Amino acid sequence: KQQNFCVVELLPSDPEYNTVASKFNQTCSHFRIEKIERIQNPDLWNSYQAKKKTMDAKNGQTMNEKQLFHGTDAGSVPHVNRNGFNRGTYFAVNANYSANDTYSRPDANGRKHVYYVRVLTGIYTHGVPPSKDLYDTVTDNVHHPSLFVAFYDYQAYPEYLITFRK
Ligand SMILES: Cc1ccc2c(c1)sc1nncn12
Ligand SMILES: [Cl-]
C-alpha cells in the first residue's frame, strides 16, 4: 500500500549495466551515461506482476511485455520510483525519442533522466482505449511501432533509471 522503494546503483561491471547501456546505445550512443539505477519497489512490482499474470491468461501467444523508454524531469524521479506511471503515458521503443529535451528535461546540472520501463503493451491498435473488452495499449503504427500509450494503473514498472548528459 505504501509502495516504499530502494534505489540500487548498478556497478559498471554488473551485467545489467552492460545490458541497459547497450539498448540505450542503439540510438543514444552520442550521450554520456553517468549512472544506471535499479528501482526496487516490492508493492508496485507485485501489482505489476498481478496485471501481467491476468494479461498472460487473456492474450494467448501474445508476448505482452516490452522494455520501453520514458523521459522525465529530475523532480519527478521520486514520484515515479514510488508510484510508477499511475495517473495516459507515452513510452518510446527507442531511447533517442525519450532523450529529447522536452521529455528528459536537463536539470540545473545538465543531467537528463530516462527510465527503461517494463510495459504491458499486450494487444494494441492505432490511436481509455477503444473496443474490439478493450485493447491493452495504443501505438502510432501497429506493424512498425515507435511509441505506445498505456492508460491503466500498474501497466508499467520503472525498473531502471538512466542518468546521462550531452
Ligand atoms: C508524443 C510523445 C509524448 C511523450 C513522449 C514521447 C512522445 S517519446 C517519450 N519518452 N518519454 C516521454 N515521451
Ligand atoms: Cl529518490
Numbering used by the authors: 1613 to 1699, 1712 to 1751, 1757 to 1761, 1768 to 1801
From the paper:
We previously screened a compound library from the open chemical repository of the National Cancer Institute, which led to the identification of the potent and selective PARP10 inhibitor OUL35.27 From the same screening, a TBT derivative OUL40 (NSC295701) emerged, showing an IC50 = 3.2 μM against PARP10. Indeed, when assayed against a panel of two poly-ARTs, PARP2 and TNKS2, and two additional mono-ARTs, PARP14 and PARP15, IC50 values in the low micromolar range (1.2–5.3 μM) were obtained. With X-ray crystallography, we confirmed the binding of 1 into the nicotinamide binding pocket of TNKS2, PARP14, and PARP15 active sites. The inhibitor binding mode is highly similar in all three enzymes, where two hydrogen bonds are generated between N1 and N2 of the triazole ring with glycine and serine residues, respectively. In addition, π–π interactions are present between the inhibitor core and tyrosine residues. Compound 1 showed IC50 of 1.2 μM against PARP14. PARP14 mediates gene transcription through its MARylation activity, and it has been implied as a possible therapeutic target, for example, in lymphoma, myeloma, hepatocellular carcinoma, and in prostate cancer. At the moment, the most advanced inhibitor for PARP14 is RBN-012759, disclosed by Ribon Therapeutics, with an IC50 of 3 nM.
